[PDB]
Design a protein around this nucleic acid. Structure first.
Lengths: 117, 26, 132, 138, 103, 95
RNA sequence: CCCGGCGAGGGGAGUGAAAAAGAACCUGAAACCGUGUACGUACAAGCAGUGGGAGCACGCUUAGGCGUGUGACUGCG
RNA sequence: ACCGGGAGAUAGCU
RNA sequence: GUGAAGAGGGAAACAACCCAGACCGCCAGCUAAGGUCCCAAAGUCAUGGUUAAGGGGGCUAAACCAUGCACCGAAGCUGCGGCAGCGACGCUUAUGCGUUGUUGGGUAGGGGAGCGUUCUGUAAGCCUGCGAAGGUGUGCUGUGAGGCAUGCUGGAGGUAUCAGAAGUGCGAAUGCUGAC
């Protein structure tokens, strides 16, 4: 019951390669290197799926601090006032408001200052 | 009705083909 | 929706005037570096040159206390001769050392123009008055 | 493999045109089956055929002449086209008539096999064949 | 003129008419859902949130249809020890159309 | 109107013929012939012969206006190995 | 019939279902080598991937925005 | 010295 | 206890130092170690003192001591969604669950559940010249091995469901054959 492995092997190689487009030469043509490149790219993607949260958190904090400093209050004191003011607006929405409309951010910061003491 | 006939559960074991990949154990 | 990202073409960057008359070297340089990076603006983006144009005037008035007046060294070179020949170079080197390394960092640094005299031909750009 | 020489070796399985590592040899696959087991299987198959209305009993099944047309007409009259006619003494006329028809097979009482019974839709066995099978199965 | 509300634990700022992505909340396609948890209402003169979870208004949303997200490949494998472990993931989601905000 | 002519199994290295052909790609026939006349490389003769065959095919099979024909496409490809042969292809068209 | 050296080779006409069957003649992938289109590209690096991502061309999108094509810059590697 | 066979030789480890 | 067989964060870099055991997705929040001058996210925060001792620049605090309130800070905890194992009340029996609590890093190793290629019966059945096998792109689909429909080429075979047998799944053995 001899069996030829050509069809399945070629299909597997095509499946591996099709998800390796654009890897600067050998990595997109040599299977022995293409498989390793794909695995490394997958591992990096897995790590970045978690690092994205950290990066966006840092960006939002920076934007909130930049917006607040225009009002004369540091980011730490601003968020402390918001927490003591009993406001659950997260940092993403704060950054969006700061970059979109400044009136809402002014209201938020003045309420925070009022609630600081 | 040769299609309907099937072995009793547990009578036949596929067996282990060691050395074929990593997801099959050995 | 996706978080807003600064556009490197439609972002408006203004002009400012900074005077180093009796200003601490470290603090003034740090404020200049922070402002040039655009972190002060709400549209701050790490990969976009959103900073403004800041003009530093009278670099010869740089103030440093303690023994650093003579202990400081430059490359050999010393603080006294370097400040005498070109006061702007101290601020330039400080800002370059206090900015990211790469094409974006050098591009942001290029926007910093410093002179030892109050008069400057760049006044045609309507440079705003700023205090450090 | 024809040839020789060990200058490694050319007849190794890895080498092209080399011998097979586990070359097969002519073997036998026959499996022993207990006589009581076989009789029980036959009885179970017969019971299953009976309960499914796939079994037809006829007092006598005879053909006047060894003509396949007559056998085909007789089977058509009984709404049968794929059957396993079973009888006692293997009449020459019936066997000759049914030899050509691919869908119709006729065998003596002692020639019944599990595969033949199961594969064919309906099984027709004469009363004499019924008695012979009953005696055989004990 | 918009509103900030919390649905799946992550706050969303949504404008009227525009559809917004939300977690797979178990509700029939036809029925509309009211998001009483409104964390901010925005207008020409926005009303501030004196008390958390302002109850001055509610938000109407309509689930046009459910569905699964885009295929994502995860490789828990690491250390380059010559093993492959690829798994597929397709997160559930719902696109809800919000029309009308109560101040 | 786009005539094609090729020479198969040319007894010349593919790289040299490519070098010769690249000098005339996108040019016009009138000056392409003159450029090929003084090219001392051996492949120049073969390229000129192929171009002449292309012009002959265009003028005979197709309608007219040999003068305004342009070398829209020209290339050389590797051929069977006995040493490597080459296949030369030239396309001449009014546009 | 024509170019080509009365060669090789090729283009027309024609047979043929097909000449995407032409005697190197069923099907004809990969490495390798070429032209066209779009994008980026230049001090050596040591990785040349990955999250964000403008810009650059092409379609949908009333549009906004979306996918596809490359990937300036940027966190990590 | 070379060719075919004992020989898919024998212990060892890679 | 750490690696072997444990990811992640901090100590500039670094297996041994500290916190901390990665089921998966989220552009959600709260924390441990360590930090809040820029590089780089956080106090150029307050109180009473010492001072010249300081990964890059600079530091008169941007160095140190003690106190207070804050913030950043990981794959840690929590919020939503999704999958699987296991102990348990109930119908349910061959399974759906109304659920509950907990678990889901992992080499060697053991156990369990699966996809895929050839042939044989099913099969003188089904599809198929209104287009089979193969080649080549697309979309859908399954946690995966895979499956399904279709554009072009291909131009005549493939085989459903259920069972039986393998010369059965290549990434390297200075492997062998052919081509570059």
């Amino acid at each position: 019951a001899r069996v030829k492995r050509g069809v399945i092997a070629r299909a597997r190689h095509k499946k591996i390669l099709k998800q390796a487009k654009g890897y600067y030469g050998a990595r997109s043509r040599v299977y022995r290197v293409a498989f390793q490149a794909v695995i490394k790219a997958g591992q990096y993607a897995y790590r970045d799926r978690r690092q994205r949260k950290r990066q966006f958190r840092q960006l939002w904090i920076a934007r909130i601090n930049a917006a607040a400093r225009q009002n004369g209050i540091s980011y730490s004191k601003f968020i402390n006032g918001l927490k003591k003011a009993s406001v659950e607006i997260d940092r993403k929405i704060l950054a969006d408001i700061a970059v979109f409309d400044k009136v809402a951010f002014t209201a938020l910061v003045e309420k925070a200052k009022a609630a600081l003491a | 009705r040769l299609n309907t006939l099937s072995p009793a559960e547990g009578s036949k074991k596929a067996g282990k083909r060691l050395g074929r990949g990593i997801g099959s154990g050995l | 929706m996706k978080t807003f990202t600064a556009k490197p073409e439609t972002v408006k960057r203004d002009w400012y005037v900074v005077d180093a008359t009796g200003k601490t070297l470290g603090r003034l340089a740090t404020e200049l570096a922070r402002r040039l990076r655009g972190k002060h603006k709400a549209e701050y983006t790490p990969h976009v040159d959103t900073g403004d144009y800041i003009i530093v005037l009278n670099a010869d008035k740089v103030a440093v206390t303690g023994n650093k007046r003579t202990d400081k060294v430059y490359y050999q070179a010393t603080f006294e001769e370097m400040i005498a020949r070109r006061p702007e170079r101290v601020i330039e080197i400080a800002v370059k050392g206090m900015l990211p390394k790469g094409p974006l960092g050098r591009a942001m640094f290029r926007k910093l123009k410093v002179y030892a005299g109050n008069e400057h031909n760049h006044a045609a750009q309507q440079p705003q008055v700023l205090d450090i | 493999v024809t040839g020789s020489g060990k200058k490694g070796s050319i007849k190794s399985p890895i080498w092209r045109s080399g011998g097979v590592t586990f070359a097969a040899r002519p073997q036998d696959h026959s499996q022993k089956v207990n006589k009581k087991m076989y009789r029980g299987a036959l009885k179970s198959i017969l019971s299953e055929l009976v309960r499914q209305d796939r079994l037809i009993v006829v007092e006598k099944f005879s053909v006047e002449a060894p003509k396949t047309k007559l056998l085909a007409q007789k089977l058509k009259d009984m709404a049968l086209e794929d059957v396993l006619i079973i009888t006692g003494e293997l009449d020459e006329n019936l066997f000759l008539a049914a030899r050509n028809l691919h869908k119709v097979d006729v065998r003596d009482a002692t020639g019944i096999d599990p595969v033949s019974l199961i594969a064919f839709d309906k099984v027709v066995m004469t009363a004499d064949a019924v008695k012979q099978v009953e005696e055989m199965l004990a | 003129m918009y509103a900030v509300f919390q649905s799946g634990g992550k706050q969303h700022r949504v404008s009227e008419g525009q559809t917004v992505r939300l977690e797979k909340l178990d509700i029939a396609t036809g029925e509309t859902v009211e998001f009483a948890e409104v964390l901010m209402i925005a207008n020409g003169e926005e009303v501030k949130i004196g008390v958390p979870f302002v109850d001055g208004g509610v938000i109407k949303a309509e689930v046009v249809a459910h569905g699964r997200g885009e295929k994502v490949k995860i490789v828990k494998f690491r250390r380059r020890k010559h093993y492959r472990k690829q798994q597929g993931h397709r997160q559930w989601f719902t696109d809800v159309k919000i029309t009308g905000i109560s101040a | 109107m786009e005539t094609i002519a090729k020479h198969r199994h040319a007894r010349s290295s593919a790289q040299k013929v490519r070098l010769v052909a690249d000098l005339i790609r996108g040019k016009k026939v009138s000056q392409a012939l003159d450029i090929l006349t003084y090219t001392n490389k051996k492949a120049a003769v073969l390229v000129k012969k192929v171009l002449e065959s292309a012009i002959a095919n265009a003028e005979h099979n197709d309608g007219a206006d040999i003068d305004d024909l342009k070398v829209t496409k020209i290339f050389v490809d590797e051929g069977p190995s006995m040493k490597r042969t080459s296949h030369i292809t030239v396309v001449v068209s009014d546009r």
